[PDB]
Each structure stands twice: as C-alpha cells, then as structure tokens.
Design a protein around this ligand. Structure first.
Ligand SMILES: *[C@@H]1O[C@H](CO)[C@@H](O[C@@H]2O[C@H](CO)[C@@H](O[C@H]3O[C@H](CO)[C@@H](O)[C@H](O)[C@@H]3O)[C@H](O)[C@H]2NC(C)=O)[C@H](O)[C@H]1NC(C)=O
Ligand SMILES: *[C@@H]1O[C@H](CO)[C@@H](O[C@@H]2O[C@H](CO)[C@@H](O[C@H]3O[C@H](CO)[C@@H](O)[C@H](O)[C@@H]3O)[C@H](O)[C@H]2NC(C)=O)[C@H](O)[C@H]1NC(C)=O
Ligand SMILES: *[C@@H]1O[C@H](CO)[C@@H](O)[C@H](O)[C@H]1NC(C)=O
Lengths: 48, 145, 36, 48
C-alpha cells in the first residue's frame, strides 16, 4: 500500500553452520511510506 | 478561486490523463515520458496523437461555480491498534487500580478493573489480546507500565 | 567515480525455519495463532 | 555489509529508495538517483 516495512533480528550462533535449525522471529524496527513502485534492489559494501 | 484562481489563468496545476495502467493506492507518478496514445511507437518529445500529462485547468475566476479551484486535504489515518502519537484535546485523569472504572486508553473505551500485569510486552506493542479477540492488557501512555 | 568492482558469485541453500516475524503489533501468549 | 537500494528503474527516470548505514545512525532517502552500476561505500583515514 505504498508503505515500506522493515523487520529484523540478530542471534549468536555456534559454529555448526549458518542458517541453523531452531527458531527466532524478527521484530518490527522501521516503517516509512515511500508512495512508489519497487521492482529491483541491491546492497552497499564498505571497502576499507 | 479567491486565492488560487487568476484572470490570466493558473496553468501550473498539472493533471495526468494518461498512464499505461491504473496505479495502486497512495502512489504518485511524476515521470514526464511520452505516452503512446497512437497505435505505433511515438519516441522522443512528440508523435502522432501522442502526449505528455494533460494541460492544466483554465483556473480563471469567471469560469463558473463547481468548475473553479477547490483546495482539498484528505486526512488518512489508523487507530486503536498501535502506539499512538496524534490525537484530540481530551485530558488524562489520574490512573486508579483494583477498582471498577470506565477506562479509556488512547481512545480504547471500556469497563473493567485495572491491575499490575506480569506481562513482558515488546516495546512496539500497545495492546494485548485474548482468544475472543478483545483487549485484556494495555501499556499506559503516560508512565510506561 | 562511477567505478565497477563487485565480483559476485552465488550458490544455493535450504532456509529451514528462518524468516518468521511478528505479524502485527499486538501482544499474545500461550496461544496458536493462524495468520495470512 | 551496510545498506540497500530499492527501486523500479535506478536511473533518475523515476524516484527510488536509498538506505545507508555507518558507525552510528542510518539515513533513508527517496529520490530520482542516477545510481552507478556498482553502488558501494568507501571509508578511509583522511590525513587532513
Ligand atoms: C512498476 O514498475 C515496473 C517496471 O517499470 C512495471 O512493469 C512493467 O510494466 C509494463 C506494462 O505492463 C511492461 O511493458 C511491456 O509490457 C508487455 C510485455 O510484458 C508488452 O506488450 C509491452 O510492449 C511492453 O514491452 C514492462 O515490461 C514491465 N516490466 C517488468 C519488469 O515487469 C510496473 O507496471 C510498474 N507498476 C506500477 C503500479 O507503476
Ligand atoms: C553517518 O553518516 C551520516 C550521513 O550519512 C552522518 O550524519 C551527518 O552528521 C553531520 C554531523 O552531525 C551533519 O552535519 C551538519 O551538522 C551541523 C547542522 O547544523 C552543521 O554544523 C554542519 O555544517 C552540517 O550541516 C549532517 O547534516 C548529518 N547528515 C544527515 C543526513 O543528517 C552521521 O554523523 C554519521 N555517523 C558517524 C558516527 O560518523
Ligand atoms: C508530562 O509532560 C512533562 C513535560 O513534557 C514531562 O516532564 C513528564 O515526564 C510527563 N509525564 C509523564 C508521566 O511522563
């Protein structure tokens, strides 16, 4: 509905493997109405 | 018209007659690309029966009534579900506990006794609900318990 | 400064139970809640 | 890894969403950005 919703979590994990079996839900953290179409996306890396 | 209409007209009030489909709710498009209202690919600034968004209204004071400028504001909002931040000029009372009262929390009116809970609400939560879908706990908006 | 640099390669993985989130901002406890 | 672009066209023909994080606070903006085919962040020791 033109509203961009962000949910997130972090969890400590022992070195079996990433995305482990178990459970944890994401809490809502940010919300903002952009009022626009979205079709594509990318991510910012930080080089030293 | 008393403040947005002009005897020279006021052609800065643009409106869009053309879009490839109907847009969804609360969405504004400001792109100026040519629209193919002719059956063949109109490219660049012009083409046969092809257009940008439509020319603005002749907002001239003499035009006549129901046909001049009308300033509109639409207040869209939601309520009674979530941590509120904008409301009416109603005063808070003191808070009383263990006694039967007609409460109101952020417009959630009801009748009950108010008690110290043992419930760990997460910070984003204003109301706590039951199996009958009715509010059985609330976070006080003045002191956060 | 419109530099290209990102060398991105990918593989595939099973997202077992991940990406569940609180569906609305109402407290609930000791209940099973059906949500779409 | 710090932030994201979300959009329909990413080339200033229409508005698009940018999220950027750093060491403290985040900035969000929706704009007719002309992104670079590789959007990324540099942070470095500025001698001045
Ligand atoms: C949100 O942005 C999307 C990308 O701009 C847009 O999708 C695009 O929609 C048009 C019209 O349907 C497509 O144009 C093509 O449509 C068919 C082929 O699918 C042909 O008959 C046409 O000649 C033309 O080539 C785009 O290809 C399509 N792009 C994608 C990636 O799907 C949405 O319509 C936009 N929605 C809103 C509400 O703005
Ligand atoms: C993370 O990056 C943020 C920008 O993406 C940055 O925010 C910027 O912080 C500076 C310093 O507080 C602000 O600079 C302004 O400060 C006052 C305003 O009155 C003036 O003296 C300055 O001339 C200047 O206008 C920026 O405005 C602010 N940018 C935004 C978008 O708010 C954070 O500070 C960065 N965080 C860290 C830890 O470095
Ligand atoms: C009432 O408003 C004042 C002034 O902003 C503030 O100091 C006070 O903490 C508020 N009351 C409560 C219970 O927080």
């Amino acid at each position: 509905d033109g509203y961009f919703k962000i949910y997130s979590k972090h969890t400590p994990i022992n070195l079996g493997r990433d995305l482990p079996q178990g459970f944890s839900a994401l809490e809502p953290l940010v919300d903002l109405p952009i009022g626009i179409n979205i079709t594509r996306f990318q991510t910012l890396l930080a080089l030293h | 018209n008393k403040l947005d209409s002009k005897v020279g007209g006021n052609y800065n009030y643009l409106y869009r007659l053309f879009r490839k489909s109907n847009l969804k709710p609360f969405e504004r498009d400001i792109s100026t690309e040519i629209y193919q209202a002719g059956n063949k690919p109109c490219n660049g600034v012009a083409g046969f029966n092809c257009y940008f968004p439509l020319r603005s209204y002749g907002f001239r004071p003499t035009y006549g009534v129901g046909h001049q400028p009308y300033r509109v504001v639409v207040l869209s909002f939601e309520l009674l579900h979530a941590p509120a931040t904008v409301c009416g000029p109603k005063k808070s009372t003191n808070l009383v506990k263990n006694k039967c009262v007609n409460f109101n929390f952020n417009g959630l009116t009801g009748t009950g006794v108010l008690t110290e809970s043992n419930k760990k609400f997460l910070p984003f939560q204003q109301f706590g609900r039951d199996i009958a879908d009715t509010t059985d706990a609330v976070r006080d908006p003045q002191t956060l318990e | 400064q419109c530099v290209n640099l990102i060398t991105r390669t990918q593989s595939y993985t099973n997202s077992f139970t991940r990406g569940v989130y609180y569906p609305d901002k109402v407290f609930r406890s000791s209940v099973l809640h059906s949500t779409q | 890894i710090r932030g994201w672009i979300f959009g329909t066209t990413l080339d200033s023909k229409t508005q698009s969403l940018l999220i950027v994080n750093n060491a403290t606070n985040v900035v969000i903006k929706v704009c007719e950005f002309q992104f670079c085919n590789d959007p990324f962040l540099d942070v470095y020791y500025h001698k001045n």
